[PDB]
């Protein structure tokens, strides 16, 4: 499941290297052999289809597909349907015998969960769900309700999905506030920090994501680098430096995995080099991070410029500041970079509503100004009497 959806994501994102394409489905090629992945690997092969995912032995085979590995065979189905049936048949009478013998309940639910996991291996966003229902139907335990999480987490994030599972996560979480004791809370927070990481988490669960580590990861629903990676980035890109320089300044967590995946090396690291307030070095470390981090990984791509430019803003906002003063030149020039261009997007922060920057172009000079009490007193005030006016009419719609 796990690398699937990412190796999916990997090749679905393939831009940089054929490897980006190649190496992912490479496994998936072996993995659709490993598991009968076709039924979504079907639509997975229609997922990145009509980009470079255009070469399949079922869906489409196109030269403009740089990925041929998005291919099938009908044997896969034969393989599948056999495996499928085999799985099915076995569990069927098994479950049917569990039904026959009135054998256990969770034990009935047992093969159900077994029935369930296939559709993860299979890729069926299906029976497993109904199975889960008839698993959960047989659940006398939140520990089986735990499997909802497991199920739903495998559900949503086999496709890297959204809400229902999150809602299910909400649902399955809200049920027992035992939060799987300490743990499923994490699993909750994990995928919650992932659901909400679609596309956001930003300030929100990145904390939580950072908050609990290393307390879980999943294997099939996530790796440990993953959570760390993700948790770092957003939480870093978002959260309070104090926190970050309390926490991601370093954590035994980090200290453990620092450069261990090499892959990061940057996220906080070269941002700790930002957090080392270079001018340049980080400004390369950006894309040095970006393409090594954002493009590669699921949400990390789709959100994109949220980061970019926001750390790119971040570098303006707390690091370089407005700045309250100093000729833009000494910034824009004495930092050995494009005066105008840098200044432009930098100036594009003037109306971004975030700049207390006060910026001249001619004199290449920058200033600042208190933000008074504005903050968010009435500004949003409008929204709700409106949100009432919704009701207020909706009410006035009640009537008869």
């Amino acid at each position: 499941n796990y690398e699937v959806s990412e190796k999916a994501f990997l090749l679905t994102q393939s831009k940089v290297s054929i490897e980006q394409r190649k190496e992912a489905a490479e496994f998936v090629l072996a993995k659709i052999k490993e598991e009968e992945m076709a039924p979504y690997y079907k639509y997975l092969c229609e997922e990145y289809l009509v980009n470079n995912g255009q070469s399949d032995l079922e869906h489409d085979e196109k030269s403009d597909s740089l990925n041929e590995w998005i291919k099938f065979d009908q044997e896969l189905y034969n393989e599948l349907c056999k495996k499928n049936e085999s799985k099915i048949k076995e569990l069927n009478e098994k479950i049917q015998k569990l039904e026959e013998d009135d054998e256990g309940e969770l034990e009935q639910a047992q093969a159900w969960i077994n029935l369930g996991e296939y559709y993860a291996q299979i890729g069926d966003k299906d029976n497993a769900e109904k199975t889960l229902g008839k698993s959960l139907s047989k659940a006398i335990s939140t520990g089986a309700k735990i499997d909802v999480m497991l199920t739903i987490a495998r559900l949503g994030f086999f496709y890297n999905d959204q809400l229902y599972v999150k809602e299910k996560l909400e649902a399955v979480n809200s049920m027992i506030e035992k939060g799987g004791d300490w743990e499923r809370r994490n699993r909750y927070k994990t995928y919650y920090g992932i659901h909400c990481l679609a596309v956001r988490n930003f300030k929100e669960a990145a904390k939580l994501l950072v908050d609990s580590l290393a307390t879980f990861t999943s294997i099939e629903l996530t790796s440990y680098e993953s959570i760390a990676t993700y948790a770092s980035v957003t939480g870093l890109f978002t959260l309070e430096r104090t926190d970050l320089k309390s926490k991601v300044i370093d954590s035994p967590e980090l200290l453990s995995l620092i450069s261990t995946t090499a892959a990061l090396q940057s996220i906080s690291s070269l941002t700790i080099s930002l957090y080392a307030s270079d001018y340049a070095s980080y400004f390369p470390y950006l894309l040095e991070t970006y393409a090594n981090v954002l493009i590669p990984c699921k949400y990390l791509n789709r959100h994109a410029d949220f980061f970019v430019r926001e750390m790119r803003r971040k570098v303006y906002a707390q690091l370089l500041e407005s700045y309250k003063t100093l000729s833009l030149k000494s910034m824009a020039s004495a930092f050995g970079v494009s005066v105008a261009f840098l200044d432009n997007d930098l100036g594009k922060f003037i109306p971004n509503k975030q700049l207390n920057c006060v910026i001249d172009r001619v004199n290449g000079i920058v200033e600042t100004n208190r933000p008074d009490n504005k903050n968010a007193q009435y500004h949003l005030l409008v929204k709700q009497g409106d949100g009432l006016l919704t009701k207020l009419q909706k009410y006035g719609a009640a009537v008869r």
Binding site: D102, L106, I140, S141, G143
Partner: protein
């Protein structure tokens, strides 16, 4: 011609302000009586709770008031003798010493070290690994409990009491409670 015609529509429109005042009527007068309504009950002798000892054919319920002692006293007409029960929490007409109405009876376990916790909770998985026992337990208890007649179908007398013998102290109670 139409001279006085639409003159209706003048007062014909007035039909509303009526109904405002009509809305107001309720909107007002409801309060008044209501606010007034409390005034009476503020005059009360009291209301006796009671602990029914029992009834008899007499339709005088036989009762011990909690601070008082036992009195056998008539009921409210609005209740049966049959709906009644002993110990029953009831409004007793204070000085009439007849049932004013019935309350929720309160009851009831006891103490003396014979006391009853009623269907306790645990789940057997939590000492898990014993399940061979648990299965045996289920077989000696749950399956007897869940479907005794399987054993009646077999035509035995299924276990009415059970033994467990071996390593002590796992939360052994859990073994019992979780099944129970």
């Amino acid at each position: 011609e139409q001279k006085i015609q639409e003159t209706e529509l003048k007062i014909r429109s007035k039909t509303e302000n009526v109904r405002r005042l009509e809305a107001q009527r309720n909107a007002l007068n409801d309060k008044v009586r209501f606010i007034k309504d409390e005034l009476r009950l503020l005059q009360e002798p009291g209301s006796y709770v009671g602990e029914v000892i029992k009834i008899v054919s007499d339709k005088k319920v036989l009762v011990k008031v909690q601070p008082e002692g036992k009195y056998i006293v008539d009921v409210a007409k609005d209740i049966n003798v049959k709906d009644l029960k002993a110990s029953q929490r009831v409004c007793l007409r204070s000085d009439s010493y007849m049932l004013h109405k019935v309350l929720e009876n309160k009851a009831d376990p006891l103490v003396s070290l014979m006391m009853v916790e009623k269907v306790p909770d645990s789940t057997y998985d939590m000492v898990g690994g014993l399940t061979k026992q648990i299965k045996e337990i289920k077989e000696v208890i749950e399956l007897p409990v869940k479907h005794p007649e399987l054993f009646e179908s077999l035509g035995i007398a299924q276990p009415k009491g059970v033994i467990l013998y071996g390593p002590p102290g796992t939360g052994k109670t859990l073994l019992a409670r979780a099944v129970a």
